[PDB]
C-alpha cells in the first residue's frame, strides 16, 4: 500500500480462476429465446400466449406511489368479475389464494380490469361448429363468421402491459382558496412526539375489545 490512494479491498483472494464465466452468448441467447416463444405462439392456433395479471401496488415505503404487475387475481376479484377459479384459469386469467383485498379501491380496479379482458375475448367452440353457452361464467362460444373475420384482425395486446400512471403534478389552484394558517411542520413533529402515548391508549382499547 502506498500514499494517497484508497485502501485495497479486492475479494479475489479465495480461488477465482476456476470460477469466471464470460458471456459471449448475449445476442445469440436473446435470439434463441425470441425464436422459441414466437414458434410457440405460432403453434398455439393464433391465440395469445401471454396470461392476464392483476395490477398491484408495490411493497413498503420505497415504492408506495408506484404500481406493477402482481401475481394472481384473488377469489374476491374473480367473484366480482363473475368467474370461478378453474374456469378463469382455462381462459388464461391467473389465480392465487394468497392475495387478499385490503382496501376498496384495489378490488374495484382489479374487477374492472378482469371485466375489460373478459368483454374483449371471443371464444372458439371446442369441438368445431358446436357453439354453446358454456360453464363457470366463461363467455359463450361464437359462430363461424365472427371468428373468421376476427382471426383476420390484428390481436391488440395492450391490456397485458402495465398501466401507465398519468402524471398530474403540473396542476392549478386559485390563490384565494389557499389556507395559510396551517402549520405542517409543527403537526408532524407533535404527531411523532405523541406516538407512544397514542399506542398506549390503542393497546388498551384492543384489550377491552377482545374480552
Amino acid at each position: 500500500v502506498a500514499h494517497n490512494n484508497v485502501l485495497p479491498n479486492v475479494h479475489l483472494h479465495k480461488w477465482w480462476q476456476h470460477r469466471v464465466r464470460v458471456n459471449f452468448s448475449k445476442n445469440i441467447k436473446k435470439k434463441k429465446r425470441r425464436l422459441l416463444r414466437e414458434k410457440r405462439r405460432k403453434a398455439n392456433g393464433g391465440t395469445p400466449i401471454e396470461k392476464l395479471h392483476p395490477i398491484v401496488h408495490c411493497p413498503t415505503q420505497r415504492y408506495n406511489f408506484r404500481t406493477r404487475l402482481g401475481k394472481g387475481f384473488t377469489f374476491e376479484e374473480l367473484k366480482g368479475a363473475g368467474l370461478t377459479p378453474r374456469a378463469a384459469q382455462t381462459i388464461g386469467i391467473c389465480y392465487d389464494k394468497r392475495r387478499k383485498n385490503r382496501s376498496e379501491e384495489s378490488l374495484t380496479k382489479n374487477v374492472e380490469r378482469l371485466l375489460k379482458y373478459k368483454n374483449s375475448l371471443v371464444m372458439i367452440p371446442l369441438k368445431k361448429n358446436k357453439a354453446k353457452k358454456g360453464i363457470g361464467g366463461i363467455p359463450a362460444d361464437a359462430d363461424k363468421n365472427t371468428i373468421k373475420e376476427f382471426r383476420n384482425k390484428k390481436p391488440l395486446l395492450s391490456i397485458f402491459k402495465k398501466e401507465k400512471n398519468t402524471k398530474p403534478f403540473y396542476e392549478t389552484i386559485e390563490v384565494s382558496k389557499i389556507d395559510k394558517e396551517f402549520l405542517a411542520y409543527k403537526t408532524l413533529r407533535r404527531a411523532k412526539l405523541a406516538e407512544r402515548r397514542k399506542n398506549c391508549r390503542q393497546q388498551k382499547k384492543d384489550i377491552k375489545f377482545k374480552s
Binding site: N64, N101, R102, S103, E104, E105, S106, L107, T187, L188, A191, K192, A194, E195, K198, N199, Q202, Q203
Partner: protein
C-alpha cells in the same frame, strides 16, 4: 406503528394510525377422545409430582410447581400452560 380498523387513518406520513387514505375493508369429539385416552393411559410421572404440589395448595408449593414445570418442559410458556391444565384437573377431581 399501529393502525386503527375503524376511524380510518390520517393522511400524514408519520405518527399513530398514519398512511395513504384508501378506505380499509374488513368441539365434542375432541373431548371424547381425550377422555378415553386418559382412562387408558393416566398421568406422566412428572405430572404426578405436579399434582402433589398443586394438592398442597400454597403459594410456596404452587411457585415451586411453576418453576419445576418450567425446568421439565423448558420455557415459561409451556410450563405455565401445563401447570394451569393440571391445576384445573386437580380442582375438578377434588370437586
Amino acid at each position: 406503528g399501529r393502525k386503527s380498523t375503524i376511524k380510518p387513518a390520517t393522511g400524514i406520513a408519520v405518527g399513530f394510525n398514519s398512511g395513504h387514505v384508501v378506505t380499509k375493508r374488513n368441539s365434542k369429539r375432541k373431548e371424547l377422545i381425550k377422555d378415553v385416552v386418559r382412562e387408558i393411559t393416566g398421568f406422566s410421572p412428572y405430572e404426578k409430582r405436579i399434582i402433589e404440589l398443586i394438592k398442597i395448595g400454597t403459594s410456596a408449593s404452587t411457585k415451586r410447581s411453576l418453576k419445576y414445570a418450567k425446568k421439565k418442559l423448558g420455557t415459561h410458556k409451556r410450563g405455565k400452560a401445563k401447570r394451569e391444565e393440571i391445576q384445573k384437573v386437580v380442582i375438578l377431581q377434588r370437586r
